[PDB]
Amino acid sequence: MGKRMVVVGGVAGGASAAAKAKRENPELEVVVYEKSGWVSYGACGLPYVLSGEIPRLERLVARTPEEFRKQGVLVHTRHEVVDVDYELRTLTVHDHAEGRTFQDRFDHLVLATGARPSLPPIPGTEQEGVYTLRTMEDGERLLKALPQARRAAILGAGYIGLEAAEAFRKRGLQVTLLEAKDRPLPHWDPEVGALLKEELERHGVEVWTGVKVEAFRGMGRVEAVETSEGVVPADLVLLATGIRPNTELAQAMGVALGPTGAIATDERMRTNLEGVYAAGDVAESFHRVLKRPYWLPLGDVANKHGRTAGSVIAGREARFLGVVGTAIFKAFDLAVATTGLSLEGALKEGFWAKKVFIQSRDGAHYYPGSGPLWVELVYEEGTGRLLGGAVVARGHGALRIDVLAALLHREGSVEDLLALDLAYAPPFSPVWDPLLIAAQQAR
Amino acid sequence: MGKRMVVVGGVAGGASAAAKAKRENPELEVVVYEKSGWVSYGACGLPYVLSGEIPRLERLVARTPEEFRKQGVLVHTRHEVVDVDYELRTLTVHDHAEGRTFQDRFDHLVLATGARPSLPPIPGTEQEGVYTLRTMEDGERLLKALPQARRAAILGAGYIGLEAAEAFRKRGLQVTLLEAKDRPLPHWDPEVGALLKEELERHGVEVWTGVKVEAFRGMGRVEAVETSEGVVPADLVLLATGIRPNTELAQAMGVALGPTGAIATDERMRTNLEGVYAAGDVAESFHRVLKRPYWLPLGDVANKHGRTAGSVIAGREARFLGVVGTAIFKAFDLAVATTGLSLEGALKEGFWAKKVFIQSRDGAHYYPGSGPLWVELVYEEGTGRLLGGAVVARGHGALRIDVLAALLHREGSVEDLLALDLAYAPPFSPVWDPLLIAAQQAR
Numbered sequence: 001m002g003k004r005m006v007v008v009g010g011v012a013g014g015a016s017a018a019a020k021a022k023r024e025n026p027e028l029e030v031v032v033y034e035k036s037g038w039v040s041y042g043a044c045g046l047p048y049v050l051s052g053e054i055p056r057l058e059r060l061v062a063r064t065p066e067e068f069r070k071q072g073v074l075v076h077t078r079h080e081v082v083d084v085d086y087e088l089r090t091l092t093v094h095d096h097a098e099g100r101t102f103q104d105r106f107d108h109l110v111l112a113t114g115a116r117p118s119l120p121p122i123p124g125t126e127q128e129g130v131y132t133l134r135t136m137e138d139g140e141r142l143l144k145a146l147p148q149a150r151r152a153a154i155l156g157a158g159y160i161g162l163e164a165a166e167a168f169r170k171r172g173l174q175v176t177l178l179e180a181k182d183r184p185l186p187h188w189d190p191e192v193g194a195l196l197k198e199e200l201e202r203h204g205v206e207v208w209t210g211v212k213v214e215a216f217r218g219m220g221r222v223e224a225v226e227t228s229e230g231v232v233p234a235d236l237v238l239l240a241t242g243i244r245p246n247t248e249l250a251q252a253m254g255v256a257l258g259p260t261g262a263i264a265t266d267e268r269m270r271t272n273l274e275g276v277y278a279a280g281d282v283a284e285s286f287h288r289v290l291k292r293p294y295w296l297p298l299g300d301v302a303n304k305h306g307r308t309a310g311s312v313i314a315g316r317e318a319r320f321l322g323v324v325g326t327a328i329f330k331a332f333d334l335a336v337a338t339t340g341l342s343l344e345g346a347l348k349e350g351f352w353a354k355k356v357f358i359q360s361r362d363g364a365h366y367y368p369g370s371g372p373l374w375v376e377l378v379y380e381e382g383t384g385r386l387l388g389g390a391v392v393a394r395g396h397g398a399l400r401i402d403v404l405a406a407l408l409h410r411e412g413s414v415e416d417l418l419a420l421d422l423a424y425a426p427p428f429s430p431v432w433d434p435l436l437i438a439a440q441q442a443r
Numbered sequence: 444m445g446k447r448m449v450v451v452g453g454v455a456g457g458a459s460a461a462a463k464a465k466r467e468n469p470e471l472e473v474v475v476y477e478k479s480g481w482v483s484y485g486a487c488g489l490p491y492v493l494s495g496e497i498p499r500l501e502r503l504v505a506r507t508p509e510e511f512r513k514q515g516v517l518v519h520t521r522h523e524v525v526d527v528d529y530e531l532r533t534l535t536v537h538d539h540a541e542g543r544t545f546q547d548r549f550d551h552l553v554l555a556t557g558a559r560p561s562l563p564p565i566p567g568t569e570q571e572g573v574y575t576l577r578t579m580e581d582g583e584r585l586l587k588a589l590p591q592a593r594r595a596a597i598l599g600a601g602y603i604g605l606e607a608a609e610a611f612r613k614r615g616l617q618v619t620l621l622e623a624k625d626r627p628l629p630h631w632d633p634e635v636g637a638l639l640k641e642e643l644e645r646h647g648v649e650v651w652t653g654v655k656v657e658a659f660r661g662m663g664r665v666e667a668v669e670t671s672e673g674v675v676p677a678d679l680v681l682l683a684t685g686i687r688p689n690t691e692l693a694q695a696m697g698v699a700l701g702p703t704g705a706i707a708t709d710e711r712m713r714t715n716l717e718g719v720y721a722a723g724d725v726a727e728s729f730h731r732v733l734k735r736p737y738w739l740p741l742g743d744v745a746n747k748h749g750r751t752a753g754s755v756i757a758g759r760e761a762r763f764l765g766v767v768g769t770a771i772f773k774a775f776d777l778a779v780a781t782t783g784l785s786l787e788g789a790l791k792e793g794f795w796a797k798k799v800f801i802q803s804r805d806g807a808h809y810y811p812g813s814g815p816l817w818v819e820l821v822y823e824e825g826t827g828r829l830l831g832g833a834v835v836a837r838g839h840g841a842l843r844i845d846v847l848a849a850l851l852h853r854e855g856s857v858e859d860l861l862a863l864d865l866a867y868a869p870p871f872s873p874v875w876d877p878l879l880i881a882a883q884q885a886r
């Protein structure tokens with residue numbers, strides 16, 4: 001056939017769905033409704049623009065609504081879809097431009113509305129120099145504030161947030177990091193968080209841990225931050241405390257949520273309603289180690305969701321087959337890579353789990369420049385089964401993490417990892433790869 | 444028990460064996476006889492000493508005979524084992540110190556004699572500024588010649604050789620590369636050799652291809668190199684044309700050679716004689732893609748041999764389970780990694796094989812500094828089974844090659860690679876990893 005595919009949201013999942021569907025089947029009418037007035041941009045890059053490394057914000061968009069148009073795809077920014085007359089029985093789609101509101105129908109509907117910041121309840125959040133880092137507009141806001149220092153407080157020592165810390169220091173601010181749990185990167189085992197505390201500290205960041213924030217001081221302006229542990233003075237504050245999925249519209253039309261709260265999906269990205277798909281951060285994914293659904297709001301997973309929905313609609317054969325949880329981020333001079341489950345998580349799930357954590361190099365002892373390289377393996381006591389892993393390096397790669405993600409994907413034991421014929425040469429690895437050394441193999 | 448382990452050769456295979464056995468069972472009498480007067484050093488490092496980047500040649504050794512002694516291991520350099528009275532029936536081991544010759548016995552024998560340069564029959568090789576890069580003493584000889592320029596010819600455009608060209612340019616010389624076959628790195632598909640020709644050229648290296656060397660001109664000094672394509676003036680010439688294993692003493696004792704010419708072995712590194720193992724460059728290894736014995740003289744495989752033999756002897760349970768051929772080297776601003784089979788070799792072996800070759804980046808389009816990244820996949824037509832692949836980057840690393848090595852290890856298809864959840868973030872990968880892009884996925 002040659003019918004009508006409506007994409008709600010156009011950031012990553014949504015743009016992927018649109019771009020792939022129209023390529024795979026040029027008969028479709030493909031329309032994207034984005035509320036934000038930008039479309040198809042790398043949120044991941046926002047801290048590099050903040051920091052000054054990337055000169056202009058527009059650098060971050062992959063495709064313009066104009067290039068889209070050239071390619072058969074009609075994108076509307078600043079259009080919010082306010083209601084769907086689903087099943088029910090499509091029309092559906094009332095939505096809003098500049099001035100007006102109006103109707104549309106669809107044959108295939110891709111929900112790709114993303115995630116919004118998850119705001120803690122703290123009096124004084126509403127003030128003038130409290131910010132959030134999610135969108136292009138967020139970037140504009142911030143980018144205005146920044147030059148004109150002086151003192152920043154960042155709530156949340158998650159990856160973005162560690163990422164913001166570096167950006168603000170690169171922009172000359174003094175920065176203190178506040179975290180309610182005891183370590184930075186609290187969702188991973190503590191050795192890694194340690195490494196990070198030391199690197200933040202080396203670069204002038206103050207890291208307050210185990211800290212209850214009580215309010216943001218000011219008369220609508222923000223100058224403080226009052227905490228259980230004292231008062232942090234700050235004319236800019238960044239809330240970096242989580243995101244939650246944008247599910248509200250999809251519940252209105254009776255799309256089912258999964259246990260995570262994100263929209264449920266099958267290997268075809270299809271929801272519970274016929275003709276409705278979801279993609280990207282509003283959607284659950286099957287975690288392959290946990291053997292259940294999971295929310296993993298990463299941008300590469302959004303692209304793989306989007307592209308699967310896209311292909312499926314264009315009548316190609318395409319399945320999405322799940323995640324293992326691999327992430328990497330850059331914080332100052334560390335590259336921090338995780339995958340699978342941390343020992344704590346492994347334990348919480350009931351495994352009889354053990355961890356090893358080793359410190360190697362990134363190149364021969366004798367090689368000029370060779371840096372430290374840590375690897376963590378989390379495994380199942382008896383079986384040897386791999387459950388998760390971390391590698392940290394200065395390295396632009398390592399990224400060695402990818403090998404673990406590979407193994408986690410099938411069952412994959414410590415034994416299997418030992419048997420792997422990895423690449424040796426003095427500039428890149430010691431003669432035993434740090435993954436091999438960590439395998440069984442020292443403690 | 445508490446018997447006597449004798450290791451002939453003490454470079455990498457040999458050293459690993461000795462060190463692992465003594466640790467694993469301290470009751471062993473462990474003695475190493477090395478002919479070369481150095482022991483336990485990184486030949487792979489030699490070009491970085493050549494180039495000046497690593498200041499002194501001793502920086503390459505990992506353990507001194509002294510530190511070994513402290514750890515229960517007796518090493519003798521400048522000791523050649525000249526005969527073995529095998530089975531036969533051990534005394535065996537007549538060998539030679541400084542002055543003397545003498546007898547020893549063994550209960551376990553590890554043959555780790557390595558490999559020697561494989562010289563093409565060329566009149567005038569015997570002269571004064573012709574050199575080879577294999578040993579610590581080779582390193583001395585060249586380090587003497589180097590400062591004092593002026594014109595270098597390298598025969599052979601293998602990894603050492605490309606490695607040498609870089610070293611020599613960093614040391615001021617003009618360098619011309621002479622290769623008999625049509626490409627640099629003739630052993631791999633040609634895309635890769637091409638990228639290297641361009642890099643070599645961009646750094647001042649002249650690269651003569653399809654070139655028959657006829658002889659080394661001079662009166663016992665060398666100043667030329669006469670070739671089917673003209674005359675290359677050269678006061679220093681590096682022969683970098685292959686190695687062959689040192690199987691001579693082992694044949695004398697009736698140890699069996701494999702079809703490769705290297706010593707045959709089992710998963711326990713045991714030879715055909717009871718009590719006799721081999722480790723390192725003298726030893727074959729089972730290739731897991733080709734499902735037969737293979738020669739893969741790399742230093743990481745030597746450590747893996749060595750440590751297996753070692754363990755086995757101290758009566759730990761240990762097995763070596765083959766290789767897949769993964770290698771990586773650095774030539775100027777390229778890191779070049781291959782694994783499995785090139786398409787050529789794939790086809791020689793009779794697979795219905797195809798290849799894909801793609802060029803991506805190492806980091807988001809918008810990220811500062813992101814470089815190119817290429818990836819080659821070699822696969823079976825129908826099944827989708829991976830057969831080999833290459834990745835080249837500037838990257839320290841990528842090294843992504845390890846993922847393929849991983850997959851090659853189990854059967855592993857292009858499909859499987861596709862399903863992998865790798866790590867995305869702007870500094871390190873585009874949002875589709877270049878492995879993923881390559882997979883089915885563009886041509």
Ligand SMILES: Cc1cc2nc3c(=O)[nH]c(=O)nc-3n(C[C@H](O)[C@H](O)[C@H](O)COP(=O)(O)OP(=O)(O)OC[C@H]3O[C@@H](n4cnc5c(N)ncnc54)[C@H](O)[C@@H]3O)c2cc1C
Nearest residue numbers: 009011012013035043044081114115280281298299302868
């Ligand atoms: C600072 C930062 C750094 C990051 N770094 C990384 C990294 O290093 N690696 C990585 O893999 N990921 C990273 N991410 C994650 C990235 O933002 C997402 O995971 C990815 O872009 C997936 O997006 P998506 O299309 O599902 O939706 P989102 O990017 O959440 O966007 C959906 C858009 O659709 C719109 N929409 C919502 N409701 C409606 C409606 N009712 N009608 C019409 N339109 C609507 C929204 O306004 C929104 O802008 C980072 C994110 C941030 C914020």
Ligand SMILES: Cc1cc2nc3c(=O)[nH]c(=O)nc-3n(C[C@H](O)[C@H](O)[C@H](O)COP(=O)(O)OP(=O)(O)OC[C@H]3O[C@@H](n4cnc5c(N)ncnc54)[C@H](O)[C@@H]3O)c2cc1C
Nearest residue numbers: 452454455456478486487524557558723724740741742745
């Ligand atoms: C310039 C250069 C660069 C390299 N780069 C890399 C790289 O980037 N990555 C990688 O994986 N590999 C690399 N290698 C490979 C490395 O040399 C070997 O593959 C590795 O060290 C394995 O060694 P082995 O112990 O089996 O024996 P070898 O290293 O060949 O040494 C065994 C030693 O035992 C001695 N011996 C021999 N016969 C007798 C006898 N009859 N009695 C007593 N003693 C004896 C020899 O004199 C010799 O020095 C490189 C090599 C060179 C030369």
Ligand SMILES: *SCCNC(=O)CCNC(=O)[C@H](O)C(C)(C)COP(=O)(O)OP(=O)(O)OC[C@H]1O[C@@H](n2cnc3c(N)ncnc32)[C@H](O)[C@@H]1OP(=O)(O)O
Nearest residue numbers: 012015016019040041042043044062299801802803884885
């Ligand atoms: S914060 C996380 C990041 N978020 C974002 O990426 C937001 C922006 N991205 C997007 O909006 C989508 O990713 C877009 C760009 C809309 C989707 O783009 P397309 O789906 O059109 O994808 P591409 O233009 O990247 O190309 C897709 C096809 O092109 C082949 N290909 C890509 N790159 C290469 C290289 N380097 N060499 C050879 N071929 C390449 C891909 O294989 C793909 O092929 P198919 O034809 O789809 O199989």
Ligand SMILES: *SCCNC(=O)CCNC(=O)[C@H](O)C(C)(C)COP(=O)(O)OP(=O)(O)OC[C@H]1O[C@@H](n2cnc3c(N)ncnc32)[C@H](O)[C@@H]1OP(=O)(O)O
Nearest residue numbers: 358359360441442455458459462483484485486487505742
């Ligand atoms: S050109 C190719 C390279 N050639 C060479 O390597 C030549 C020189 N090398 C050698 O001679 C051998 O590799 C030597 C150094 C003699 C062998 O040394 P050992 O066998 O004693 O090995 P190590 O001292 O490296 O230690 C082995 C045990 O130590 C554990 N371990 C290593 N590194 C770490 C780090 N960074 N963090 C924690 N643990 C570490 C190894 O796992 C290994 O453990 P065991 O299981 O006890 O052997």
